[PDB]
Amino acid sequence: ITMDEEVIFETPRELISIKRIKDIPRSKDTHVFAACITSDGYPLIGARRTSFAFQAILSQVSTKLLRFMYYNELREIFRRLRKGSINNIDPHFEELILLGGKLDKKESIKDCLRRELKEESDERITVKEFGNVILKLTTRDKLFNKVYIGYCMACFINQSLEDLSHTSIYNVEIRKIKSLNDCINDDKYEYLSYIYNMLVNSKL
Ligand SMILES: COc1ccc(CCNc2nc(N3CCc4cc(OC)c(OC)cc4C3)c3cc(OC)c(OC)cc3n2)cc1OC
Ligand code: NA
Ligand code: NA
């Protein structure tokens, strides 16, 4: 990816634009993401603890939304839609997110990522080296028309994929950490692949 050129991806749920930028704006708190590459060369992705569809429903059922929730969330909704409800369609859905979190503008991007990666990983991830390229990710969700922005950098970590296979049940942020290639059927797979490919190629 070249400085300030933008690439656009569409999924059934989102329109996302990905653009290389020089500096993250520091007028407000922002969100920063890590494209994390394990020591054995696998790209990592997190499964968000709560799905975006369920969070949207809570903050406000369309059946397109029932295709994009976790099964425990669905059971909570169906217990209310059907009286003696004992099961419902399970879409085998996971809400894929890059690891990372909030950057106020006290801290460097690097200290922020080290901290958030260690909290989201139950203190297992440590960063061997960072990349130098920052990508701005702008998503517009199609169902609720909300716009969300975050900034992504490469993190080459010390741990192997296998090191990160289990995640504590008390992890408030993510249900698990996995390889992105274990998510090929997810509708975010194309643009997440692009992010990793661009950040790794820039590193090389
Ligand atoms: C209508 O009412 C609401 C609705 C939602 C919400 C949740 C807002 N929080 C939030 N939203 C995000 N988006 C954008 C993407 C997206 C995608 C969807 O499908 C794929 C989607 O399907 C429905 C909704 C969203 C909202 C985020 C995106 C991220 O990209 C990586 C991220 O990184 C960690 C964190 C994000 N956090 C609050 C509402 O009430 C105020
Ligand atoms: Na589930
Ligand atoms: Na995809």
Numbering used by the authors: 3 to 62, 71 to 214
What does the paper say about this structure?
Vaccinia virus (VACV) represents a family of poxviruses, which possess their own decapping machinery as a part of their strategy to eliminate host mRNAs and evade the innate immune response. D9 is one of the two encoded VACV decapping enzymes that is responsible for cap removal from the 5′ end of both host mRNA transcripts and viral double-stranded RNAs. The viral decapping enzymes differ greatly in the substrate specificity but share the catalytic motif and the ability to cleave m7GpppN-RNAs to release m7GDP as a product. D9 is expressed in the early stage of infection and8 together with D10, it prevents accumulation of dsRNAs, thereby minimizing cellular antiviral response mediated by PKR and OAS/RNase L.13,18 D9 exhibits specificity for N7-methylated cap structures and a preference for longer RNA substrates (>30 nt).
Three most potent compounds had IC50 value below 10 μM, and they included an adenine derivative seliciclib (IC50 = 0.57 ± 0.05 μM), quinazolinamine derivative CP-100356 (IC50 = 2.7 ± 0.7 μM), and a purine derivative SCH 58261 (4.5 ± 0.8 μM). To better understand the mechanism of inhibition, we determined the crystal structure of wild-type D9 bound to inhibitor CP-100356 (P3_B7) to 1.78 Å. This crystal form has two copies of D9 in the asymmetric unit (all-atom RMSD 1.811 Å), each bound to 1 molecule of CP-100356. The conformation of CP-100356-bound D9 is nearly identical to a recently published structure of D9 bound to m7GDP product in the post-catalytic, inactive conformation (all-atom RMSD 2.55 Å). However, in the complex with CP-100356, Y158 is significantly reoriented compared to the position occupied in the complex with m7GDP, presumably to allow more efficient π–π stacking interaction with the aromatic quinazoline system of the ligand. Rather, the 6,7-dimethoxy-1,2,3,4-tetrahydroisoquinoline moiety extends into a small cavity past D151 and E16. It is clear from our crystal structure that CP-100356 inhibits D9 cap hydrolysis by stabilizing the enzyme in an inactive conformation, preventing conserved aromatic residues F54 and Y158 from binding capped mRNA substrate. The crystal structure of recombinant D9 in complex with CP-100356 was determined, which revealed that the compound targets the m7GDP-binding site and forms stacking interactions similar to those observed for 7-methylguanine, suggesting a competitive inhibition mode. This, combined with the observed selectivity of the compound upon cross-examination with VACV D10 and human PNRC2-Dcp1/Dcp2 complex, indicates that the cap-binding site in D9 is distinctive enough from other decapping Nudix family hydrolases to enable the development of small molecules selectively targeting this chemical space. Nonetheless, based on the similarity of these compounds to natural nucleobase moieties, we hypothesize that they likely bind in a similar manner, that is, by stacking between F54 and Y158.
